[model samples]
Target chain A: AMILDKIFEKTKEDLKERKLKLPYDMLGRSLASNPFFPKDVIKALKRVEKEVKIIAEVKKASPSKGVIREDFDPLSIALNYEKNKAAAISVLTEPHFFKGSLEYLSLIRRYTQIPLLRKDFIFDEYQILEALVYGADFVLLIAKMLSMKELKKLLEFARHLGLEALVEIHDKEDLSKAIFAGADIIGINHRNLEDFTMDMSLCEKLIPQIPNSKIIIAESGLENKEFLEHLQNLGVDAFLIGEYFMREKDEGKALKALL
Target chain B: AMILDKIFEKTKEDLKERKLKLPYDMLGRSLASNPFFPKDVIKALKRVEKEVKIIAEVKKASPSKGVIREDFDPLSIALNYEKNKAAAISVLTEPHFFKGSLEYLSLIRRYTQIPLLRKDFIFDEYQILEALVYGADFVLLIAKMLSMKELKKLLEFARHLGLEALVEIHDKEDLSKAIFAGADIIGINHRNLEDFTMDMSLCEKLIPQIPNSKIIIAESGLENKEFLEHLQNLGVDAFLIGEYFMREKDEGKALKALL
Candidate 1:
């Protein structure tokens, strides 16, 4: 079985227990009276004219690389990313494999003023509501895991709720679905879902196919300035880096050096 | 402060945490594919001709009585009620003073095929959805605590989801609101919300004012057959007894004796 299937199954099980505990009516009331409005991620990325913006992610552990940060403090890390002039912060909220929490996202929001991307295995509208309720500016919607109908519906729902979706794609089929769904911010992830392998060459192949109107973001496997500059030269608008920055003791200095 | 105010405040606070944990979307999905159809409480109560039916309750504790059933086994109690030819079973699912759970309602549903009433402090539509999802045939909506608009909205939402509402009332104004909300099942609660005091005279006064078209159920302070027979003579179609039955060593025998 693929890693995606395992993650999807676990996510569905977790969601079932969560629904029983919370329910929809309560979420509707909270959403109706929510004071915090979502910050525009696309606007934040495009604020700089020539520079390649960064969407720095606050990830603790991953399926590929077990525990990345032993002393992980999400709010401080998020603040550091913001202080270093990062465009937006990606908060990983997946619990089991990733070791992340929605509480971290909400906590960071209270301290910082930058946009936050809720990175998780999102396939339902309920998660989008969760993202907005937990103070997310944008949500990561993977095209590989979702069908064409689901992709379209989820994207529309996100727009309706004033929350942006970063439609993550791996291949031509996924890219077609993201574009067909009218995703304003398209995230091109280089990591394979099956074996967790990184391939920078996939970004080289898919970046040329996307239209100039859509804001394109390159996700995963950003190691050095040379590789980032190469992707930037290929018309990539933003970079979603997590592992490289998360490994460093001083994340803010690492981000500044990269910029 | 009134006990209703304390319960309502605690309930709201609990609801806020629950919404954050579970959410509305998750509840919607569970509701969309739920297999168990709601058993009609009104039909069950009206099945027998010329005899007042019994809606036996599975209660653990109460604010006034403290712990009514110290060794409470909800599923067995429900099965025993069903075996005793009860018209319906009332499952108290309030968490605080009552020490009840939605799990008990769902658990009892697995054993008994009779209609189950979800007894709780319900004021929001979310609670009604929770009732349906947790395998309740009907829900308890107190008219004393909710406004006319809230009562109407909650009752209508319950009907829309194929769940019945037992609109509980103490006085004429509550009865008027219950009527205005088009509630079919009117529960005449003898207990006062402020002091938790029981008075059968309230039910006697209210039952005479209600039209014969609606199904009236007398609730609380049901101590003996003489009082139950008295309510029946006053046109009460059913009796909802909890404290008296819960206090007995054999709830089924207590119900049988009362009948």
Candidate 2:
């Protein structure tokens, strides 16, 4: 089985346990009484018009690499990223493969004022409501995971709860799906899920086809200043870099160098 | 082995893991940069004159009961308690025996406006700092776990971080230790740590000895309105009830009935 297929299967099983523990009716009541409002993610991204923004990630492990950082402290890492001026923070909440938890998003929200992105294999409205309750300003919706109709429904639900969606795509077909779903922010992921490989040309091939009005983010395989500058030249609005920052001895300095 | 002894042993092991993962220096940095201020727990408890304030707990399981509520959602429970006029919320953050996590405290903070108490086997400044970073307004410091000197030190540390300490005791000796340590608020827990049994007379015996200036709270073994009214007549400032509300089908209504 492919890695994505395994993730979906595991996600479905976990969703059953979560729903049983916290039914949708109870989750809705919590959502209705939530006092915190969503931060403006799109405005945060477009704050600096000419300069490319950076959305640093708080990730512990990956399916391909197993574990990326051994000394992982999501709260500290997030504070450092904010101190070093990252536009937003992406917290990977996939439990099995990524070694992430929704709790991290909730913990990081108390300290930082910047927007938070719930990075996970989100398929249902349950997960989106979970995102809102857990203090996410936006959520990640991968084009490969849902149908066009499903994507539209999830996107609408997210907006209803006052959240944005970062529609992630790997190719032109995914881009078409994202656009059809009315995604204002489009993330062009450089890493391929099939072989778990990085290809920078994927962004190069897909960026031109996307409308200029939509925000374009280059995701994964971001290493140094040169590549980030290259993407900036391609009119990318933001960059989502993870492994390179996670592997560094000083993540704040690593992020500072990129900016 | 006694249940308290085993809990202490497990807590030490978990503390070592937590310190290694997040060093004191890094934690201090996060604490220094924390934006949210601690809520006024003392004032919250003292708000209603001649009425016993409710400090409802968001507990999942107990040492004796194994699992109190199978359909546990900390955020929802907290919101319900707040809507029903609970003065404060106590979140159990102990991992092994109680099936609790510090993450729940952080999750609950976003939704509820009431003060939060971090209830755990806290022995070090690291755990207290964890409470502050995780959005705790006050923390529980057991008299049996520490000497008068240690209690004074932890209480001072909590004050330095703008948080209150609910010094907990079971007997006259523990009450003397709390008094000597200058605790502003004292929690008289009815459950004996040795046998895991309830003794309502413990509060009746301890409440009169405490100075009038100090706030006294009756903890554990709180079930029905009659028992609560009896405790209120004993000059108890607040009540920390868990199992009764957790076992009920409608927690908010249960709390409302007591109020």
Candidate 3:
């Protein structure tokens, strides 16, 4: 009990203070405390029907803002992505930061064979494994939040447990951290973690520099297909898109229109 | 392998610093790899009567601000939620922050036919499927972090696979995003994301903005009937509340007083 309390105290503070995300309990329980298996990323790799893949995210709202959709359904929308040739699906399973749920992911899984990504503010190895158990082919590990060493260990652990990793980098510094950590699957995120100021240019600027062997995914720039095609032209293997999809009346039609 | 060695060399310095939870290799991995269905969400969604409803949430904490509930149980507390004639129930499944679990959801579902919302940080599609499998009537999605593409796709996916979505939003911008996403069931959260700033006025700001057909749900910051009445008059359809009801000295009488 004493040990548990200490573990609780140790985990009570912010592992990453810049953002609000899932954290372990004072008694030492948090999603990051779980391990991951990269179920979605791996499955996403397989479901790539086109030369360039699309990672359509499944999300509704976040903690900061209240509700995004007046009526939201997961399985139906995921199927639409499948119908639209989305290579994989990313589910925001974190609750505090994003008002989301794991149960929704499972519900979608039963409906489709598309690879699933558990996109979250993951801090512990326990969450990684738990994600794997929940059928995630891959997961996002924020480079900024974790120390280089922690990132490396967690990355290695994820690979060992049959999970691929999407190393999220907000800037050049984060990219360096990812490279050192051996994360070949890199996502150059335009949304700044420091203040949420986005630099879509960061993805474009970093794309030409990242190693070709690395599957560079451009996140936050897929509202229009002209933009997606532009990204594709830039050697982006995949596009991880969300906000526009969440806001569109017909994601399938809008994406189709983008095409 | 060579990769592991490389990663190890990169991580040696920092792995020794950050305090992490005991890696329950399988616990978290299992959760992420596979999805758990909430049989409860499914049930309640199947039973929503023709009336505007608000479901109370009982959460303990988040990654940023901790401790929403003092002593929590799904069955006893959920029993109170159901008795108040709520259309559904929302349970915080993330343990570390919400101090909740799939087990709690399961326990609650075993006792009621009411639709249940598995409220947590959901980042994977597997979690959605899992929610349905576990008997959840609906699951939540956040708009802040999610793109519109993923949100619409997942909404369609949920309807197809049997999970309803409680699309959460924060500001007018997010509400617009939800409307654009073709969301029918909407949730409005009043808490500030950066800090726990409970600004109920944001709800009022957005109340008149939503369409009449949309099911507006007011979440967060409902401490008393006065707040709910304000929401009800503004044409909000449902409410996903937790702490206010959970912290009540007498849950039954307190809930009755509020309803």
Candidate 4:
């Protein structure tokens, strides 16, 4: 937990002493906001691990979705998901796209025992540190949305510390880059943020070459139970679902739909 | 205020057409997305209705109550009760009963000029459009929850439209389904939808009678000397009282407790 941000003013000063300029005010603002960041995340993850396979989500009421029904109790929902049977939960804290707040992650961690993934755009280094404070077990780096150099530098930080990385790809080029950067988990996204067109075939396209032991997750555009079952057959370690569950008459039934 | 989804969408569109969309959209979207929406709702209303009352709230949590609080941040603890000074304040925002969303409304509105009312389930059309908007003019509308016809028609297009109508009824036959359709300044409640089989007594039973001025405000379960004095002496303008307020510690004090 980078909780001591005020103290980190000295860290920033030290960076300046070496004439270094970091991107996005990176001391991270979590520990200062709340002291129990990691403990909550670990609790949520452990509880989720006892249930089903992982399906962490990046929650946001984005441009494509307008305003989604933000559970007035995001913390309760996150905790309840794990208590019921969630393998992992991705919380979209993005303010602009999916009406989310950073405080959401921090609060959710306080009440759950599940893996909490900080669903965010990893453009800001400061944000990565912030995620650690907000209780992110794994950080999602949207490969399709990041440059190789920026992605590379960020990955180095994760490797230096003890954070897992999920390199998300929308196409072969993004996959190639994540692999080059030694991404531990590969998140093959079916939906194209660039064009809004989706094709999960990208996973099949990469599977032949992906190592059997590799951690791979199928992301988005998964509206069909059959398709998800097909992915499970193909050996996807995780299947991230968000909007579909929300689009049902009962959220609990939606979660149980696949099981 | 446009409770009609059709009307609200059309209003947004109309605003877009006239450029009035910016302020309205900014304010409305801010309300929908940000917990930090405007707090001036209470402060603003104070300027126009100097005599307007306040109603704070209390509670632990809810499922049906999911409409508001994630946790039981009582309207009393959160708003800090007005101590019978601010006209009126509601303490009953049903936790498992009403789909109340108080987390967003809780802290921010504390910065206003009136007593806050956590107005809730008034089976007699006691609360709805009154408490769901930009200010603290909350009322409990339980009576209307059961009457589909009454609930359907009783819509406040906005806070500005509530007419002189706050009615409450217990018996199914006595339910005024017509006024609800024309409701703006009404609070249709005093009857719980699931209480048909309960042993509930007359709400306006020992309480005062409904006046001919605005509407019927049936308050049965209330217990605050000041609250009783206010309702009995002031005639409530419209309301019932006795048992409900007793559950809280001195709810008769601050209607919408301090922010």
Best candidate, lDDT-wise?
2
Candidates sorted on DockQ, descending: 3, 1, 2, 4
Indicate the worst ten consecutive residues by lDDT in candidate 1 chain B.
B25-34
In model 2, which regions exceed 4 Å deviation?
A1-38, B1-259
* Model no. 2, DockQ: 0.01
Model 4 DockQ reads 0.01
lDDT of 1 by residue, A1-259 (tens): 2432333345346546755765452332233222454455678876245685899999999877899999999988998999998999999987666788878987887777677888877766666766766777778888887788889877865654456889999999999899889997888889877567778788789988998667889998897888888887787888999999999999988898888
User: In terms of TM-score, which candidate is stronger, 2 or 4?
Assistant: 2
**CA shift of A175, model 4, Å:** 1.1
lDDT, candidate 1, B1-259, per-residue tens: 2332333344346456756766453333233222344455668976255675889998898866789989999988988898888899999887666788878987887677678889987765556666765678788887877789989978866764457889999889999999999999999988777666777698768877887789899888887898877877778889898888888898889888876
**Predicted candidate 2 versus true structure: per-residue lDDT over B1-259, tens digit per residue:** 2432333345346546645774433332233222354356788886366765899998888767889899998888998999999999999887555777889988887777778899987665556655665778889998877788988878866664456889999998898889888998999999876567778798778878988678888898898888888887788889998899999989999999997
Over the full model, what C-alpha lDDT does candidate 4 score relative to the true structure?
Answer: 0.49
> Candidate 3 lDDT (Cα, whole model)?
0.65
TM-score of chain B for predicted candidate 2: 0.85
For model 2 the local lDDT of residue A82 reads: 92
lDDT of 4 by residue, A87-125 (tens): 778888766556677788878766655567778666544
lDDT of 3 at B128: 57
TM-score of each: 0.48, 0.46, 0.44, 0.42
Ten residues in sequence with the least summed lDDT for candidate 3 chain A: A22-31
Model 4: per-residue Cα lDDT over B1-259, one tens digit each? 2122332244345434433432422322222222444333223222222143433334443222233333344444443444454433444433334334444344435443343344443332112322333233444333323455545433322222221223345554434443434432333234343332322344334233333433334344443445544443433333433234334455444243321
Residue-level lDDT for A177 in candidate 3: 84
Runs with alpha carbons beyond 4 Å of true place in candidate 4: A1-52, A56-60, A70-72, B1-259
- Pick the winner on lDDT between candidates 1 and 3: 1
Model 4 clash tally, residue pairs: 97
Docking class of 3: incorrect
A16 in model 3: Cα distance from truth in Å? 38
